Amino acid sequence: SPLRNDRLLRALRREPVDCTPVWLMRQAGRYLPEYRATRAKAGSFLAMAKNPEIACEVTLQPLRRFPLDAAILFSDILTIPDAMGLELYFVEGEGPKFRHPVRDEAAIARLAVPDMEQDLGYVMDAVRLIRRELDGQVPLIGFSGSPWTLACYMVEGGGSKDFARIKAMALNHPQALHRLLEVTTDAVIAYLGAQRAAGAQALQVFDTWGGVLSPAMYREFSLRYLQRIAEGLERGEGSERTPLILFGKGTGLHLEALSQTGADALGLDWTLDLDEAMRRTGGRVALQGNLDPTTLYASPDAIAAAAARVLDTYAAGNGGSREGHVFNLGHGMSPDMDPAHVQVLVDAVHAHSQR
Numbered sequence: 001s002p003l004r005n006d007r008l009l010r011a012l013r014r015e016p017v018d019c020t021p022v023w024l025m026r027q028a029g030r031y032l033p034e035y036r037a038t039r040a041k042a043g044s045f046l047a048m049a050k051n052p053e054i055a056c057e058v059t060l061q062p063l064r065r066f067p068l069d070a071a072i073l074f075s076d077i078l079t080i081p082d083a084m085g086l087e088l089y090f091v092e093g094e095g096p097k098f099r100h101p102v103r104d105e106a107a108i109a110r111l112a113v114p115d116m117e118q119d120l121g122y123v124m125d126a127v128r129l130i131r132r133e134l135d136g137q138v139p140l141i142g143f144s145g146s147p148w149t150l151a152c153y154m155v156e157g158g159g160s161k162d163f164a165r166i167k168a169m170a171l172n173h174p175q176a177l178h179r180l181l182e183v184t185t186d187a188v189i190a191y192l193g194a195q196r197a198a199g200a201q202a203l204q205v206f207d208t209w210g211g212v213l214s215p216a217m218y219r220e221f222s223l224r225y226l227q228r229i230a231e232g233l234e235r236g237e238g239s240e241r242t243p244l245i246l247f248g249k250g251t252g253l254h255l256e257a258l259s260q261t262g263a264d265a266l267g268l269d270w271t272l273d274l275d276e277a278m279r280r281t282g283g284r285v286a287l288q289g290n291l292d293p294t295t296l297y298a299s300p301d302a303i304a305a306a307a308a309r310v311l312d313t314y315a316a317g318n319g320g321s322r323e324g325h326v327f328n329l330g331h332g333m334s335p336d337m338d339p340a341h342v343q344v345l346v347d348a349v350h351a352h353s354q355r
């Protein structure tokens with residue numbers, strides 16, 4: 001079925017649209033009662049994410065309420081290292097962990113690029129099912145973690161406050177860490193390409209933990225591999241290309257370098273204003289963001305005003321033009337947020353940004 005709303009894709013390509021598209025980080029999440037109901041029946045995050053029909057159900061839930069301009073695949077960045085044999089698990093209310101963290105050269109040497117349609121078939125089947133169920137209503141965004149951010153979880157065995165283990169590896173065994181990052185990057189390229197082939201119409205890379213690095217270490221251990229993704233991932237050409245989005249947080253110091261990777265768009269948070277982001281990226285990329293999600297606790301009038309502020313700040317840094325912007329939050333919605341205020345935000349973005 002032909003895509004009937006391609007606002008998102010045009011904006012990511014810096015092509016003119018009728019109003020600014022919006023989608024929201026964690027738009028499938030516990031702030032929706034129906035998400036909580038699905039989660040209680042399924043039984044765990046993995047019981048939803050590894051079963052295509054449920055991942056599809058969850059992906060489509062926000063679109064049953066809100067006129068969002070995109071769906072984002074319901075999954076987790078840690079599918080890739082789970083498929084590589086590290087055994088992802090969740091302890092009730094503790095965050096993701098791996099049974100087999102990657103701690104030595106032998107563990108690094110065991111890693112291989114998963115067979116995407118077999119080992120990660122639950123992801124690809126979900127992409128196909130979502131694309132079929134959407135039937136051209138709005139585009140589907142696929143995604144991956146960045147190689148650096150995946151490596152962080154793989155070495156640490158879970159989340160970390162300071163990433164001491166992977167940083168010690170960078171200092172004491174950089175050749176081993178580069179080999180880990182090389183195979184992980186090949187996996188990310190294969191994973192994103194397989195999602196595109198299965199039906200994903202835009203692709204986002206999350207470099208959640210790129211900001212823990214010094215400038216030199218960021219260039220060597222994260223940016224190098226983001227560049228490899230941009231160069232090595234086939235996405236088509238021109239007005240039909242599958243857009244590539246790179247997201248980072250508190251990373252306004254790397255916006256210049258990220259804007260030169262070849263990615264189409266950069267996603268960012270509220271720690272810098274979008275006009276400054278336009279200045280540092282030189283007009284080379286579309287920008288996605290950047291509303292602080294705690295705005296959704298404010299009054300409806302304040303939410304509408306804040307959406308107008310984000311939109312008008314972008315335009316002021318873009319020669320007065322609203323084009324090349326995808327409205328989004330800078331961090332995912334929280335479980336206690338009010339769906340009414342989400343609807344207020346979505347309508348306000350569309351209304352205020354009418355061309």
Ligand SMILES: [Cl-]
Pocket residue numbers: 024025026027072332
């Ligand atoms: Cl999301």
Ligand SMILES: [Cl-]
Pocket residue numbers: 026028029030031333334335
């Ligand atoms: Cl949530």
